[PDB]
Ligand binder design. Structure first.
Ligand code: CL
Ligand code: CL
Ligand code: ZN
Ligand code: ZN
Ligand code: ZN
Ligand code: ZN
Length: 244
């Protein structure tokens, strides 16, 4: 089933050398952890804050003994950039699009106390206020994307268009046939609409059909197969229809 971690994280194995770690205190946010054939560990997205992320990195160190860690932010929300403080502290190489870095820096200008009020309880508010999110150390041009090659094993980061957020990117692992679609994968309901482009979302999701994926991992909730994309398109087009 799963391994129980501190701060209400759970880790589930979905393939050889591939795990999903879920932050169950903060909106059941999913984090992909994949060990490459050459020993590099790639982490996609993040827990919301420092206690969760330290917990994640302790588990990565203990169970995978990485040669090197590369962390890829999926978008500027805290499930995305909330891990950067601890990723950096633990020596990981953090990456995001230039737009994600810009949006995180702008978000940091907002009054923190007001932002923390939308959280469930006092314990979570205190944890959020005890972390101070930072952008990634390394950036790529959003529309160009980024391809890593770890001893000829590729990891492809690409922008399919605005959907859940203006900056959402997906991460594809061709050898493992694994697509981390993040928070633009919404097979039942679209969720938080604040930064969304609902009109663009159907065509942005249509761009995910090209991937030869056996597993599609969403930003929240259970992962599935390529049908996760089909479902998302229908959910988004339903919302667009309701809109006029
Ligand atoms: Cl404000
Ligand atoms: Cl269909
Ligand atoms: Zn359990
Ligand atoms: Zn988000
Ligand atoms: Zn700090
Ligand atoms: Zn999310």
């Amino acid at each position: 089933d799963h391994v129980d971690l501190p701060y209400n994280l759970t880790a589930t194995k979905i393939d050889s050398d591939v795990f999903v770690v879920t932050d169950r205190d903060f909106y059941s946010s999913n984090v992909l952890v994949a060990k490459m054939l050459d020993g590099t560990v790639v982490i996609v997205s993040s827990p919301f804050e420092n206690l969760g992320t330290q917990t994640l990195m302790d588990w990565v160190a203990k169970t995978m003994k990485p040669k090197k860690v590369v962390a890829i932010n999926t978008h500027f929300h805290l499930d995305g950039t909330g891990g950067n403080e601890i990723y950096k502290k633990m020596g990981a190489e953090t990456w995001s699009s230039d737009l994600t870095k810009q949006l995180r820096l702008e978000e940091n200008k907002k009054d923190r106390i007001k932002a923390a009020e939308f959280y469930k309880n006092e314990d979570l508010k205190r944890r959020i206020l005890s972390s101070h999110p930072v952008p990634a150390d390394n950036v790529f041009d959003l529309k160009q994307g980024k391809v890593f090659s770890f001893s000829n094993e590729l990891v492809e980061v690409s922008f399919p268009g605005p959907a859940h957020s203006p900056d959402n990117v997906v991460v594809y692992f061709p050898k493992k046939k694994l697509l981390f679609g993040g928070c633009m994968i919404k097979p039942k309901e679209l969720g938080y609409l604040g930064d969304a482009n609902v009109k663009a979302w159907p065509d942005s999701a249509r761009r995910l059909k090209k991937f030869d994926a056996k597993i599609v991992i969403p930003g929240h909730g259970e992962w599935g197969g390529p049908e996760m994309v089909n479902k998302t398109i229908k959910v988004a087009e339903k919302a667009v229809g309701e809109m006029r």
